[PDB]
Paper text:
To shed light on some of these questions, we have determined the near-atomic resolution structures of Vip3Aa in the protoxin and activated states by cryo-electron microscopy (cryo-EM).
We therefore decided to solve the three-dimensional structure of Vip3Aa after trypsin treatment. Domain I, however, suffers a large conformational change that remodels the apex of the pyramid into a ~200 Å-long needle. The cryo-EM analysis shows that the coiled-coil is relatively ordered starting at the beginning of α2 (~D45), and that the flexible end is formed by the most N-terminal region of the protein, which contain the residues forming the first alpha helix in the protoxin state. Close examination of the structure of the toxin revealed that the coiled-coil of Vip3A, which resembles other four-helix bundles such as the SNARE complex (RMSD of 3.4 Å for 232 residues), extends ~160 Å and that the average internal radius of the modeled section was 1.46 Å. Although the resolution of the cryo-EM reconstruction does not allow visualization of water molecules, there is a clear peak of density coordinated by four symmetry related asparagines (N163) that, based on the buffer composition (5 mM MgCl2), was assigned to a magnesium ion. Domain I is indeed retained after protease digestion and stays tightly bound to the core of the protein through interactions with domain II, forming an essential part of the active toxin. Notably, the coiled-coil observed upon trypsin digestion forms a 160 Å-long dipole that can accommodate small ions in the inner cavity and, therefore, the dimension of this four-helix needle would be sufficient to reach and pierce the lipid bilayer.
Numbering used by the authors:
A (entry chain B): 95 to 148
B (entry chain A): 100 to 148
The structure:
Amino acid sequence: EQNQVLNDVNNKLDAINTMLRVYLPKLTSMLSDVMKQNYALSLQIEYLSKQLQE
Amino acid sequence: LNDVNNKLDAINTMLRVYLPKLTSMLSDVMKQNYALSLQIEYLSKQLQE
């Protein structure tokens, strides 16, 4: 019984951990893209400020 | 070993529940940033007029 319950632990944890491995890089890339988009918005607002100065 | 099993399974199902929420939240944040970009383009058109 001990060996089979340990096998169950093994498979459960390995599956969930590979799911986490798949997930995390997606979040990292999403945050990087969000920061890039915020920088783009900053540039747009600087252009707006130049327009207002003109 | 049973204690290890239950602890790790519980925490791992918690992580499973959590992560998709973060993914959806980031997608919605990016969509909202795109909406802000469109609003600012409309502002620029107003300023050109």
